[PDB]
Design an enzyme around this catalytic site. Structure first.
Site, PDB file in Angstrom:
ATOM      1  N   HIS A 230       0.824  -1.187   0.000  1.00 63.41           N
ATOM      2  CA  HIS A 230       0.000   0.000   0.000  1.00 63.41           C
ATOM      3  C   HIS A 230       0.872   1.256   0.000  1.00 63.41           C
ATOM      4  CE1 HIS A 230      -2.963   3.009   1.220  1.00 63.41           C
ATOM      5  NE2 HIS A 230      -3.881   2.132   0.847  1.00 63.41           N
ATOM      6  N   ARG A 273      -3.130   0.775  -4.123  1.00 64.53           N
ATOM      7  CA  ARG A 273      -2.867  -0.652  -4.163  1.00 64.53           C
ATOM      8  C   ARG A 273      -3.240  -1.116  -5.544  1.00 64.53           C
ATOM      9  NH1 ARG A 273      -6.777  -3.291   0.313  1.00 64.53           N
ATOM     10  NH2 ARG A 273      -7.804  -1.268   0.743  1.00 64.53           N
ATOM     11  N   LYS A 276      -7.130  -1.244  -7.282  1.00 61.37           N
ATOM     12  CA  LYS A 276      -8.061  -0.282  -6.671  1.00 61.37           C
ATOM     13  C   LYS A 276      -8.135   1.039  -7.481  1.00 61.37           C
ATOM     14  CE  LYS A 276      -9.127  -0.597  -2.442  1.00 61.37           C
ATOM     15  NZ  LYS A 276     -10.471  -0.628  -1.841  1.00 61.37           N
ATOM     16  N   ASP A 279      -6.803   7.999  -6.693  1.00 58.67           N
ATOM     17  CA  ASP A 279      -7.158   8.960  -5.662  1.00 58.67           C
ATOM     18  C   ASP A 279      -6.046  10.007  -5.602  1.00 58.67           C
ATOM     19  OD1 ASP A 279      -7.431  10.337  -3.128  1.00 58.67           O
ATOM     20  OD2 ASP A 279      -7.959   8.474  -2.136  1.00 58.67           O
ATOM     21  N   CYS A 281      -4.792  11.878  -3.243  1.00 55.54           N
ATOM     22  CA  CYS A 281      -3.798  11.960  -2.141  1.00 55.54           C
ATOM     23  C   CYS A 281      -2.558  11.096  -2.423  1.00 55.54           C
ATOM     24  CB  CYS A 281      -4.397  11.640  -0.774  1.00 55.54           C
ATOM     25  SG  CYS A 281      -5.058   9.981  -0.553  1.00 55.54           S
ATOM     26  N   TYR A 282      -2.736  10.050  -3.220  1.00 53.31           N
ATOM     27  CA  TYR A 282      -1.608   9.229  -3.675  1.00 53.31           C
ATOM     28  C   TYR A 282      -0.680   9.948  -4.660  1.00 53.31           C
ATOM     29  CZ  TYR A 282      -4.173   5.572  -1.406  1.00 53.31           C
ATOM     30  OH  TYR A 282      -4.870   4.824  -0.483  1.00 53.31           O
ATOM     31  N   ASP A 334     -10.176  13.912  -3.710  1.00 53.16           N
ATOM     32  CA  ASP A 334      -9.834  12.539  -4.096  1.00 53.16           C
ATOM     33  C   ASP A 334     -10.056  12.318  -5.598  1.00 53.16           C
ATOM     34  OD1 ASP A 334     -10.317   9.779  -4.746  1.00 53.16           O
ATOM     35  OD2 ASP A 334     -11.195   9.347  -2.843  1.00 53.16           O
ATOM     36  N   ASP A 341     -11.531  18.535   1.131  1.00 56.13           N
ATOM     37  CA  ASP A 341     -11.109  18.467   2.521  1.00 56.13           C
ATOM     38  C   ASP A 341      -9.663  18.926   2.622  1.00 56.13           C
ATOM     39  OD1 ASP A 341      -9.296  16.009   2.645  1.00 56.13           O
ATOM     40  OD2 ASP A 341     -11.112  15.061   1.871  1.00 56.13           O
ATOM     41  N   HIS A 344      -6.787  16.196   1.475  1.00 54.77           N
ATOM     42  CA  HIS A 344      -6.585  16.167   0.046  1.00 54.77           C
ATOM     43  C   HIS A 344      -6.016  17.431  -0.529  1.00 54.77           C
ATOM     44  CE1 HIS A 344      -9.029  12.471   0.255  1.00 54.77           C
ATOM     45  NE2 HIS A 344      -8.175  12.122  -0.696  1.00 54.77           N
TER      46      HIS A 344
HETATM   47  C1  LIG Z   1      -3.316  14.290  15.145  1.00 54.50           C
HETATM   48  C2  LIG Z   1      -4.015  13.090  15.837  1.00 54.50           C
HETATM   49  C3  LIG Z   1      -4.186  11.956  14.852  1.00 54.50           C
HETATM   50  C4  LIG Z   1      -4.634  10.633  15.467  1.00 54.50           C
HETATM   51  C5  LIG Z   1      -4.302   9.479  14.493  1.00 54.50           C
HETATM   52  C6  LIG Z   1      -4.599   9.851  13.031  1.00 54.50           C
HETATM   53  N1  LIG Z   1      -4.055   8.831  12.127  1.00 54.50           N
HETATM   54  C7  LIG Z   1      -2.800   8.802  11.626  1.00 54.50           C
HETATM   55  O1  LIG Z   1      -1.919   9.641  11.840  1.00 54.50           O
HETATM   56  O2  LIG Z   1      -2.461   7.784  10.778  1.00 54.50           O
HETATM   57  C8  LIG Z   1      -3.205   7.983   9.648  1.00 54.50           C
HETATM   58  C9  LIG Z   1      -3.925   6.918   9.116  1.00 54.50           C
HETATM   59  C10 LIG Z   1      -4.692   7.123   7.972  1.00 54.50           C
HETATM   60  C11 LIG Z   1      -4.725   8.380   7.381  1.00 54.50           C
HETATM   61  C12 LIG Z   1      -5.561   8.582   6.144  1.00 54.50           C
HETATM   62  C13 LIG Z   1      -7.064   8.749   6.450  1.00 54.50           C
HETATM   63  C14 LIG Z   1      -7.640   9.054   5.072  1.00 54.50           C
HETATM   64  N2  LIG Z   1      -8.909   9.789   4.963  1.00 54.50           N
HETATM   65  C15 LIG Z   1      -9.902   8.998   4.261  1.00 54.50           C
HETATM   66  C16 LIG Z   1      -9.494   9.013   2.770  1.00 54.50           C
HETATM   67  C17 LIG Z   1      -8.429   9.586   2.204  1.00 54.50           C
HETATM   68  N3  LIG Z   1      -8.480   9.375   0.881  1.00 54.50           N
HETATM   69  C18 LIG Z   1      -9.564   8.657   0.614  1.00 54.50           C
HETATM   70  N4  LIG Z   1     -10.174   8.450   1.780  1.00 54.50           N
HETATM   71  C19 LIG Z   1     -11.443   7.704   1.970  1.00 54.50           C
HETATM   72  C20 LIG Z   1      -9.065  11.082   5.292  1.00 54.50           C
HETATM   73  C21 LIG Z   1     -10.042  11.796   4.569  1.00 54.50           C
HETATM   74  C22 LIG Z   1     -10.242  13.151   4.802  1.00 54.50           C
HETATM   75  C23 LIG Z   1      -9.466  13.815   5.753  1.00 54.50           C
HETATM   76  C24 LIG Z   1      -9.628  15.219   6.039  1.00 54.50           C
HETATM   77  N5  LIG Z   1      -9.693  16.331   6.293  1.00 54.50           N
HETATM   78  C25 LIG Z   1      -8.501  13.110   6.463  1.00 54.50           C
HETATM   79  C26 LIG Z   1      -8.288  11.756   6.229  1.00 54.50           C
HETATM   80  C27 LIG Z   1      -7.152  11.199   7.106  1.00 54.50           C
HETATM   81  N6  LIG Z   1      -7.231   9.780   7.525  1.00 54.50           N
HETATM   82  S1  LIG Z   1      -8.423   9.391   8.676  1.00 54.50           S
HETATM   83  O3  LIG Z   1      -8.344   7.914   8.980  1.00 54.50           O
HETATM   84  O4  LIG Z   1      -8.131  10.186   9.932  1.00 54.50           O
HETATM   85  C28 LIG Z   1     -10.097   9.722   8.134  1.00 54.50           C
HETATM   86  C29 LIG Z   1     -10.817   8.729   7.482  1.00 54.50           C
HETATM   87  C30 LIG Z   1     -12.108   8.996   7.035  1.00 54.50           C
HETATM   88  C31 LIG Z   1     -12.695  10.242   7.235  1.00 54.50           C
HETATM   89  O5  LIG Z   1     -13.968  10.462   6.796  1.00 54.50           O
HETATM   90  C32 LIG Z   1     -14.007  11.455   5.766  1.00 54.50           C
HETATM   91  C33 LIG Z   1     -11.988  11.243   7.888  1.00 54.50           C
HETATM   92  C34 LIG Z   1     -10.696  10.969   8.338  1.00 54.50           C
HETATM   93  C35 LIG Z   1      -4.017   9.451   7.900  1.00 54.50           C
HETATM   94  C36 LIG Z   1      -3.263   9.256   9.048  1.00 54.50           C
HETATM   95  C1  LIG Z   2       2.550   9.558   8.565  1.00 52.50           C
HETATM   96  C2  LIG Z   2       1.246   8.757   8.456  1.00 52.50           C
HETATM   97  C3  LIG Z   2       0.588   8.224   9.754  1.00 52.50           C
HETATM   98  C4  LIG Z   2       0.689   8.534   7.178  1.00 52.50           C
HETATM   99  C5  LIG Z   2      -0.479   7.857   6.800  1.00 52.50           C
HETATM  100  C6  LIG Z   2      -0.214   6.607   5.944  1.00 52.50           C
HETATM  101  C7  LIG Z   2      -1.484   6.078   5.228  1.00 52.50           C
HETATM  102  C8  LIG Z   2      -1.976   6.829   3.995  1.00 52.50           C
HETATM  103  C9  LIG Z   2      -2.185   4.934   5.658  1.00 52.50           C
HETATM  104  C10 LIG Z   2      -3.337   4.371   5.068  1.00 52.50           C
HETATM  105  C11 LIG Z   2      -3.997   3.210   5.902  1.00 52.50           C
HETATM  106  C12 LIG Z   2      -5.173   2.395   5.244  1.00 52.50           C
HETATM  107  C13 LIG Z   2      -5.984   1.439   6.127  1.00 52.50           C
HETATM  108  C14 LIG Z   2      -5.505   2.485   3.890  1.00 52.50           C
HETATM  109  C15 LIG Z   2      -6.520   1.833   3.172  1.00 52.50           C
HETATM  110  O1  LIG Z   2      -7.468   2.821   2.686  1.00 52.50           O
HETATM  111  P1  LIG Z   2      -8.814   2.583   1.735  1.00 52.50           P
HETATM  112  O2  LIG Z   2      -9.117   1.151   1.482  1.00 52.50           O
HETATM  113  O3  LIG Z   2      -9.905   3.432   2.279  1.00 52.50           O
HETATM  114  O4  LIG Z   2      -8.322   3.337   0.350  1.00 52.50           O
HETATM  115  P2  LIG Z   2      -7.537   2.608  -0.911  1.00 52.50           P
HETATM  116  O5  LIG Z   2      -8.620   1.596  -1.433  1.00 52.50           O
HETATM  117  O6  LIG Z   2      -7.140   3.590  -1.931  1.00 52.50           O
HETATM  118  O7  LIG Z   2      -6.287   1.750  -0.319  1.00 52.50           O
HETATM  119 ZN   LIG Z   3      -7.434  10.162  -0.813  1.00 55.81          ZN
END
Ligand SMILES: CCCCCCNC(=O)Oc1ccc(C[C@@H]2CN(Cc3cncn3C)c3ccc(C#N)cc3CN2S(=O)(=O)c2ccc(OC)cc2)cc1
Ligand SMILES: CC(C)=CCC/C(C)=C/CC/C(C)=C/COP(=O)(O)OP(=O)(O)O
Ligand SMILES: [Zn+2]
Lengths: 405, 318
Positions: A230, A273, A276, A279, A281-282, A334, A341, A344
């Site tokens: 991933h 991955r 899939k 998006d 953010c990748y 995305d 957001d 992104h």
């Molecule tokens: C500062 C305290 C943090 C506590 C732990 C946070 N987690 C962490 O540092 O590790 C991470 C694990 C996963 C992430 C990515 C997710 C991704 N998402 C969801 C997403 C992204 N691209 C497609 N999707 C579906 C998002 C989405 C929007 C935002 C905003 N603004 C932030 C994230 C960050 N995180 S997430 O797990 O905290 C999250 C997942 C779903 C959400 O619903 C929209 C919101 C946040 C980031 C950090």
């Molecule tokens: C520094 C730090 C903590 C960085 C964050 C690293 C990061 C992006 C982790 C993702 C974890 C995860 C469960 C992804 C699957 O997402 P999904 O199945 O919703 O999306 P996908 O199908 O595109 O993999």
């Molecule tokens: Zn994304």
């Protein structure tokens, strides 16, 4: 006669999905996205207008200026991630070349102080327990600000104690006390430790090898040994190894074949991955591997490396981000039909910058799609803050000894 | 004994008599906040009371029920989950009942990390995996690619040595969607931890299954990555029939993945000093430039690098 935009050329129609007349959930979902993206690409022809790609800088700036202060209740889900919001917003402004008023700089500093735990690290908000993720964001935000005040917020002694309290025998780190391990946690620890000069000789003992156990049959890196490859975890894994000077632990060839395969032939953006969806953010997590691999492979004397371009389609990524990932009201996303957001916005912009700026020693070379105003400030591929912010932070903390020495 | 957050008769904690002895603790964001979330009344009210019970370290049944509501409003709050676990232990709460709870919450919010970690802690407190594979299979039936679900499954199978029926599960899912890269990865996880690939009966079986999948769906990249994956660290040229068999697929089953695999075979041949360098080398470059220019241009920069690295070390040169 010729089309400057790669995505709009007649030939590009051939890059559409071939489903071999075998439909599965994954092919049906991929076809839907490609149908939507093709509408976006086509809309210039159908409306009978010349294409011009513009980054809506002013709209993005207003969206960010406001969010730095106040957020709607949609962000309730991120109430344990407030230092992340500081980082994502402040980094986006730095990429857009927008200065931070001394006023807001000091207000961020005081807020992050409130998030800091007495035993070390930062939590997700005032009074919350510490966690490596908000610790990373907080340290990165403070470095972006880059003033003496900001540097002085961080308790380096406590931070080091905190990192030791998370370190496990097999090389790994827990995300927080009573939490579990992740490749992300190693990156957060190495990022924060290296920037603030607190790396002891044993802190990362075992860590390179734990990370190496996470590379799988695919070439990429999973969150823990055995898990699918991933982009987010691969970024974290390689960048942590770069900081530890242990990149060689990995099979870099399988890793390169893996990332490069993650760019979508039709959309131009990256997937996270295999099999899939694209998006935005990748744009950062996958494409930011390319500058890290370049520098890795150059350090082993790879004479076949380009001196002008990264090993991905820089132009197609820019075209994806600019045409498909901008919200007209400001902010980025995305894919079309998703909501904007701050996350992104941060990583779409970080990815655009990477795609615009090549740098390998004395060799510098830019590629800027659309109007020339679209050029962003550069970002450091390890830390995702400005390269100037990295030099400057690392220099300041090199003034002090690793606690206690 | 519970009042649901979406009940028409839900009442704010500040209006509940059972809570009159305790003073809520408002959030301290300072005199000029940043990233200040304008919370709903309901959210702010739950969290003002959570802060109060956290600060007093009140280990009571009412505190335990409050963690429920705090979690429902923000299930990513890892501070609330920690306190809930402290409470489960101090109050001697029935852990099967708590298992029933986490099942329902995972069903609703399957892409949250905190929720899966909590389940893990419960399974390790109870030393009881008996519900896990069936539970996980229910989550995967709704999203067959859920990363947290696959990870919890691997952990479960590893810690309690539950390998015996997993390859069969993999086969079921591969039939449902042969492009599911999570299932291909799980196949590798099972085989490499059971029989291993350093065998004939097993291997040959694996290469055969895959070439058969490739034939049904030639543009499915997952099968191509698996094939490469299970052969590559031995050295592709160890298997001399493989080249000819791929070349036999081309006129009816061509893809950029087939040509790209051809180039990997030629590269290992060249590294192991095959018969007839310039012959093999030129075939590879032809292919590289077909991909760069025509068949896989999104990767032009990669394929030009591969063409280059090759020439740089397998030309006529000394
Ligand atoms: C500062 C305290 C943090 C506590 C732990 C946070 N987690 C962490 O540092 O590790 C991470 C694990 C996963 C992430 C990515 C997710 C991704 N998402 C969801 C997403 C992204 N691209 C497609 N999707 C579906 C998002 C989405 C929007 C935002 C905003 N603004 C932030 C994230 C960050 N995180 S997430 O797990 O905290 C999250 C997942 C779903 C959400 O619903 C929209 C919101 C946040 C980031 C950090
Ligand atoms: C520094 C730090 C903590 C960085 C964050 C690293 C990061 C992006 C982790 C993702 C974890 C995860 C469960 C992804 C699957 O997402 P999904 O199945 O919703 O999306 P996908 O199908 O595109 O993999
Ligand atoms: Zn994304």
């Amino acid at each position: 006669w010729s089309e400057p935009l790669y995505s709009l050329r007649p030939e590009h129609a051939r890059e559409r999905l071939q489903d071999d007349s075998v439909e599965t959930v994954t092919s049906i979902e991929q076809a839907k996205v490609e149908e939507k993206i093709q509408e976006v690409f086509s809309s210039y022809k159908f409306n009978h207008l010349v294409p011009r790609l513009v980054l809506q800088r002013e709209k993005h700036f207003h969206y960010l200026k406001r969010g730095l202060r106040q957020l709607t209740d949609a962000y309730e889900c991120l109430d344990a991630s407030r230092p992340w919001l500081c980082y994502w917003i402040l980094h986006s402004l730095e990429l857009l070349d927008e200065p931070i008023p001394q006023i807001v700089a000091t207000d961020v500093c005081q807020f992050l102080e409130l998030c800091q735990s007495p035993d070390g690290g930062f939590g997700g908000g005032p009074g919350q327990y510490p966690h490596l993720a908000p610790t990373y964001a907080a340290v990165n935000a403070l470095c972006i600000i880059g003033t003496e005040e900001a540097y002085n917020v961080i308790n380096r002694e406590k931070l080091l104690q905190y990192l030791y309290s998370l370190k496990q025998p097999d090389g790994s780190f827990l995300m927080h006390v009573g939490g579990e391990v992740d490749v992300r946690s190693a990156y957060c620890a190495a990022s924060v430790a290296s920037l603030t000069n607190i790396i002891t000789p044993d802190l990362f003992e075992g860590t390179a090898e734990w990370i190496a156990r996470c590379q799988n049959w695919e070439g990429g890196i999973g969150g823990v040994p055995g898990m699918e490859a991933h982009g987010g975890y691969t970024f974290c894994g390689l960048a942590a190894l770069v900081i530890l000077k242990k990149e060689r632990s990995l099979n870099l060839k399988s890793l390169l074949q893996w990332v490069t395969s993650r760019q979508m032939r039709f959309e131009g953006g990256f997937q996270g991955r295999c099999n899939k969806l694209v998006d935005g953010c990748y744009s950062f997590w996958q494409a930011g591997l390319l500058p890290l691999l370049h520098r890795a492979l150059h350090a082993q004397g790879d004479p076949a490396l380009s001196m002008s371009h990264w090993m991905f389609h820089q132009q197609a990524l820019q075209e994806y981000i600019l045409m498909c990932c901008q919200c007209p009201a400001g902010g980025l996303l995305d894919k079309p039909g998703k909501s904007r957001d701050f996350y992104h916005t941060c990583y779409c912009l970080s990815g655009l910058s990477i795609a615009q700026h090549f740098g390998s020693g004395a060799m510098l070379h830019d590629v800027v799609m659309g109007v020339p105003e679209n050029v962003l400030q550069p970002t450091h591929p390890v830390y995702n803050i400005g390269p100037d912010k990295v030099i400057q932070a690392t220099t300041h903390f090199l003034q002090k000894p690793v606690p206690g020495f | 004994g519970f009042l649901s957050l979406d009940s028409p008769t839900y009442v704010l904690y500040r209006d509940r008599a059972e809570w009159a002895d305790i003073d809520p603790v408002p959030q301290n964001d300072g005199p000029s906040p940043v990233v200040q979330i304008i919370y709903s009344e309901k959210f702010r009210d739950v969290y003002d009371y959570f802060r109060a019970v956290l600060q007093r370290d009140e280990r009571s049944e009412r505190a335990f029920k409050l963690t429920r509501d705090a979690i429902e409003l923000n299930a990513a709050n890892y501070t609330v989950w920690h306190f809930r676990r402290v409470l489960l232990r101090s109050l001697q709460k029935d852990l099967q009942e708590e298992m029933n709870y986490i099942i329902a919450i995972i069903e609703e919010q399957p892409k949250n990390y905190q929720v899966w970690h909590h389940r893990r802690v419960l399974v390790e407190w109870l030393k009881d995996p008996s519900q896990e594979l069936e539970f996980i299979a229910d989550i995967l039936n709704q999203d067959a690619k859920n990363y947290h679900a696959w990870q919890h499954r691997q952990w479960v199978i590893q810690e309690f040595r539950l390998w015996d029926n997993e390859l069969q599960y993999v086969d079921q899912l591969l039939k449902e969607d042969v492009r599911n890269n999570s299932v291909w990865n799980q196949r590798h996880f099972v085989i490499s931890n059971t029989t291993g690939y350093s065998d004939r009966a097993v291997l040959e079986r694996e290469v055969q299954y895959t070439l058969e999948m490739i034939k049904l769906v030639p543009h499915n990249e997952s099968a191509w990555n698996y094939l490469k994956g299970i052969l590559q660290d031995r050295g592709l040229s160890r298997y001399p029939n493989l080249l000819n068999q791929l070349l036999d697929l081309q006129p009816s089953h061509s893809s950029p993945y087939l040509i790209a695999f051809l180039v990997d075979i030629y590269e290992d041949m060249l590294e192991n000093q095959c018969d007839n360098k310039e012959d093999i080398l030129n075939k590879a470059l032809e292919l590289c430039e077909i991909l760069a220019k025509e068949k896989d241009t999104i990767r032009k920069e990669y394929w030009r690098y591969i063409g280059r690295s090759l020439q740089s070390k397998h030309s006529r040169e000394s």
